[PDB]
Amino acid sequence: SSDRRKARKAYFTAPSSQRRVLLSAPLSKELRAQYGIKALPIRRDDEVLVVRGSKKGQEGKISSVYRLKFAVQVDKVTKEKVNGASVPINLHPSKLVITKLHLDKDRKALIQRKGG
Amino acid sequence: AQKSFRIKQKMAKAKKQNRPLPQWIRLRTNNTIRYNAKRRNWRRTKMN
Amino acid sequence: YKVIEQPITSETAMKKVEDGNILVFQVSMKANKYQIKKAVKELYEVDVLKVNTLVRPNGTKKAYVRLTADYDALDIANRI
Amino acid sequence: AGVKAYELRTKSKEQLASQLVDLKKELAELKVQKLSRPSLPKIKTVRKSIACVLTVINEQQAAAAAAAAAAAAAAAAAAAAAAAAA
Amino acid sequence: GHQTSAESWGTGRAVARIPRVGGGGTGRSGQGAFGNMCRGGRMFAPTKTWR
RNA sequence: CUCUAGUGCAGAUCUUGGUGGUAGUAGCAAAUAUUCAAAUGAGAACUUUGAAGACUGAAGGGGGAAAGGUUCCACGUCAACAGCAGUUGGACGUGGGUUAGUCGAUCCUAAGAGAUGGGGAAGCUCCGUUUCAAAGGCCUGAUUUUAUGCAGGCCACCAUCGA
RNA sequence: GUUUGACCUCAAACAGGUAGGAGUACCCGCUGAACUUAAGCAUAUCAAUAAGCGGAGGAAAAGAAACCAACCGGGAUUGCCUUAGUAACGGCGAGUGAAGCGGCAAAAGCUCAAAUUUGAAAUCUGGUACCUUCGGUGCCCGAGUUGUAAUUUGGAGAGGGCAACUUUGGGGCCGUUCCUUGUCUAUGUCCUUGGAACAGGACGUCAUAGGGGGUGAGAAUCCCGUGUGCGAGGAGUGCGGUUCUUUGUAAAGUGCCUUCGAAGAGUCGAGUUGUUUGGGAAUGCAGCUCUAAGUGGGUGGAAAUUCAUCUAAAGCUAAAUAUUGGCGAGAGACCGAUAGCGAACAAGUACAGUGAUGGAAAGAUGAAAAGAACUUUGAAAAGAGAGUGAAAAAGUACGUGAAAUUG
RNA sequence: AAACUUUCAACAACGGAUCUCUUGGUUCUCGCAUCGAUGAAGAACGCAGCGAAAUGCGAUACGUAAUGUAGGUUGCAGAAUUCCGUGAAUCAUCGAUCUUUGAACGCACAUUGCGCCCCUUGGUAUUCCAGGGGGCAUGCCUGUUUGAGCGUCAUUU
């Protein structure tokens, strides 16, 4: 209901079906103007960009997507380590926007199923 | 004493739990204290 | 339940196979003296005399697998 | 991984006799892996060939069982009427 | 408030006549729900749905 | 712009906890002397080793059962923690070792008690077990085998449980 | 000797199915108390309940007249509003305290006999024999038709047969509804101070959806969702419509002919007690023991007597209603780590008690961990330069910070 | 005399409140509403590149299978290994799953230990054990094989 913690309850112990969707980020403007869709879920080999933030409007990709954590590693947002290893580094995917959507087998038929 | 059958693995369970507090605990918290309440000491508590 | 898990192959089983004959085993718990001996006899390929039992405070029952004279000891233990 | 469920059901009893014995031949290696430190790229194949060979063997039991006759005996089809006691 | 038991005892040990510690009782006072001046006992006017 | 409630703190030898107080004071564990040299080291009265003495020897020697249950052991650490130091510990952490027909784990008698069924009676429970029961010998019939095993007929002379 | 059988009393082993337990609340029944109040006080009263045990179910549990009104009239159980502190009881002291009538909600009714004394063609049953595997065959116990009527007695009130078939049921088909899966979620971009814009400034649209929460800062348009439309695939649990048999069997309506019927005894209640405060005390109700009639017996708070009214002592039945162990959604003048669920966090886990059990300490960086390379001093601790980064005036024991304590 | 003593200022230091916080309530409102011998709720002890250990699994062990869903590799995790880029595999369902042990249950016992009666199957010297399977004497109920007393008291001898 109207509740902070008890609304977050559903988000926290969300099933794996809902955790597909809750790996969310918006779509870019020429993806909306191509299709129609608001957001679509976020996966590994998508080209990404940072919306709100100091990392402002830079090019990136995603390295890893994680299931329970929700947070994704972002390629090109790269710092080192104390030992000196150039790693992709974490961000929560709300701070991101994807520029790639693939066509594939029948994601082609997902986005244009019965409603679309 | 002479031990029976179903005493032995209750005692084995107790001496297995005589190991330290799990080290996974303060990877979730990081540093901040989480203290626990069981194990067994030899001088003090016996088993059930 | 069922009888045999595996041998226990620490440095202790490398004492009592060179000198004192046996293969030290760590089987299941309700696996008695008769059951363990004939189960070794079919499985491993060795003839077996008195096989003994002892449970530690770890809960697991050991078995003391004594062999016959025509068979070996070292080429009985190290086959796996 | 090893064999598979839906394939075992569509077998015949003449083939399932071979499945029982020849699947648990590799099981001898799996117990040796526990002793020599386990590792999932060898040790992971230890589960479903207990009942999945026996239940598909008991397809020939259950589908033949509806042609019995006598009195007395229970465990076969007797504890089926539990949620039909009322 | 009746989720603890704490008894009277008086002098001879370090607790009062007030039900503070007895059959348990850390910061859970009262025999039943007793002691509003005691913290974790009862309230003065415990609010009710009946009123 | 006005209506509503668990609505003003100094106190029942009270209540939730830290901190103050005597106080760095006493205590520092029943009067079985200790002296001297070394090994190792950052540090040595204490670990460990040598020289030497006090001391006990119907126990400071030896050694099993109940009860407990791996505390022994080797490996390994000096942080927390030991009425002090500390090179040390069962604290701390990890694994191993315990092989019986053979030493204990049974029948019947005592203290004493149990299991089961129906009744007397309001239950508890007492009672029945004492005749069958339980166990054994002899005879007959059908089936099968290297053997076997079963069913029927016949035998009065005994009957509760635990060191 | 010996030959041949029925009922009372009233068994044991093989062999298909069927079942155990873990649990909360709701109700009915039974052995069945008390702290207390009249400031006290054995019999008012805590009370037919706790606690313990038994019984029934998914709802429990009740009920269709041996009723009220009062000559005007009406007709089950159950819940609610009027009612009622009235009508009565209790040192008339605390206290307890109905019924009837009108209105509102949701309201349909049935199983047993001329008792019983009960037996066969066939129907048809509990147990059980042969066959020896639920299939085929046989006997006794027996239920009414039926083969066929009485016993103990009585009336003029009233019933039954016969014919036409129809409806229910069963079978077949369709429509409606429910469940599940699957999909589009509308509406948005610019500019600027800047570390980030959800503020401010500029221009539009959806809105049915502007409740909500999450989002690097205030949100309709950034996200998760919602309103609203759409693909079909299964199911009979409900509801509606249609079709077949008049169902070789069971009931009702319609129409015609001909003629006459009943009763449940350990109960009614009783010497006496009592589950009821026995008081003149109904009823509810039967301990010890016995015990009554169907133009006759019973309800209506004394009896003679009269009027209106009901017909037990066998049995069954829907809802208005009570309640939770599990799951989801929404909200209430409803908290923000001393509150509240035991517990927001490895809280039953370092621990303590033989012991269902008691049970503390306990929350925390940023955008990105990049969680300090490198250099230099000291023995580790500790002390300084230097880098990373938006800021290091964010340095890992990571918010704001006071005092005793303490320079 | 400012050590010992007291106050102020400047410069800080050992302790540490409250509130905005917050995958946690409470209370109230609407709609549905338990599992189990085919082995319940629950413990034991196994199953990783490295491993204290979350989380899943548990003699085809981070699963197991058919179909609709492009980049998979849960968590501490950085990294390493291995496969693919317009038909990798993700998620709902159905089917597979059911180690030991708890109702627990071959049976006594002090839960994760541990031994009896019977059948089947295998090996071996007659014998004994093993591989494995089952029940009111683990609750109840039925059929079949097949039993007795005694009376009102039978048919014939």
- DSSP track, chain A: ---SHHHHHHHHT--TTTTTTSS--BBPHHHHTTS--SB----TT-EEEE-SSSSTT-EEEE----SSS--EEEEEEEE--SS---EEEEE-GGGEEE-----TTTTTTTTTSS--
Tell me the longest C-alpha to C-alpha distance in chain A: 53
CA–CA separation, A6 and A2 (whole Å): 8
CA–CA separation, D28 and D25 (whole Å): 6
Q: Which of C10, C11, C3 is nearest to C63 (CA)?
A: C3
CA–CA separation, B22 and B28 (whole Å): 12
* Strand, coil or helix: C48: strand
Distance from CA of C71 to the nearest CA of D (A): 22
Side chain identity at D61, as an amino acid letter?
Q
Q: Which of C56, C48, C55 is nearest to C21 (CA)?
A: C48
* Chain A residues 68-107, Cβ below 7 A from strand H: 68-69, 73, 81, 85, 87-88, 90, 100-107
* D32/C80 Cβ within 8 A: yes
CA–CA separation, C18 and B36 (whole Å): 47
Q: Is the CB of D19 under 7 A from strand H?
A: no
* Residues of B with Cβ-Cβ distance to C55 under 8 angstroms: 8
* Residues of C with Cβ-Cβ distance to B8 under 8 angstroms: 55, 57, 59
* Chain A residues 15-74, Cβ below 7 A from strand H: 15-17, 19-20, 43-46, 63-69, 73
CB count in 10 Å sphere of residue A8: 10
How far, in Å, are A88, E12, E27, E37, E39 from residue E5 at the CA level? 58, 20, 11, 17, 14
Of all helices (H) and strands (E), which one includes residue E4?
none
CA–CA separation, C39 and C48 (whole Å): 10
> CB-based contacts of C70: which residues, under 8 Å, 6+ apart?
C47
Nucleotide minimizing C1' to CA distance for residue B42: F71
CA–CA separation, C60 and C28 (whole Å): 7
* Residues of B with Cβ-Cβ distance to C58 under 8 angstroms: 12, 16
Q: Which of A88, A95, A103 is nearest to A34 (CA)?
A: A103
* Residues of D with Cβ-Cβ distance to C6 under 8 angstroms: 31-32, 34-35
Q: Which of A29, A70, A78, A74 is nearest to A50 (CA)?
A: A74
CB count in 10 Å sphere of residue E31: 18
How far, in Å, are D17, D18, D56, D58 from residue D63 at the CA level? 18, 21, 11, 8
> CB-based contacts of A99: which residues, under 8 Å, 6+ apart?
A28, A31, A46, A47, A48, A49
Q: Which of D5, D56, D47, D52 is nearest to D26 (CA)?
A: D47
CA–CA separation, D19 and D3 (whole Å): 9
Side chain identity at D14, as an amino acid letter?
E
Are A and E touching by the rule of 3+ CB pairs within 8 Å?
A: no
CA–CA separation, E43 and E35 (whole Å): 8
- The helix, strand and coil proportions of chain D, stated in percent and rounded to the nearest 5, come to 55, 0, 45
Query: CA A8: distance to chain centroid?
Result: 19
CA–CA separation, E29 and E40 (whole Å): 6
Protein-covered nucleotides of chain G (CB closer than 7 Å) are 14-20, 57-58, 133-134, 182-190, 195-198, 211-217, 222-225, 229-231, 328-332, 335-336, 338-339, 342, 345-355, 358-365, 367-373, 388-390, 396-398
Instruction: Output the six-digit token pair for D47.
Output: 């589960």
* Residues of C with Cβ-Cβ distance to D31 under 8 angstroms: 5-6
Q: Contact at 8 Å (CB) between A24 and A94?
A: yes
Q: Which of D51, D35, D52 is nearest to D43 (CA)?
A: D35
What resolution, expressed in A, was reported for this entry? 8.9
Mutate to test the interface with C, among B2, B6, B8 (most CBs of C within 10 A): B8
Q: Is the CB of E40 under 7 A from strand G?
A: yes
- Report the DSSP pairing between strands A72-79 and A87-91: antiparallel
Q: Say which residue the tokens 């339940």 belong to.
A: C1
Q: Say which residue the tokens 């039909």 belong to.
A: D84
How far, in Å, are A10, A79, B9, C3 from residue A1 at the CA level? 11, 41, 49, 57
Tell me the longest C-alpha to C-alpha distance in chain C: 36
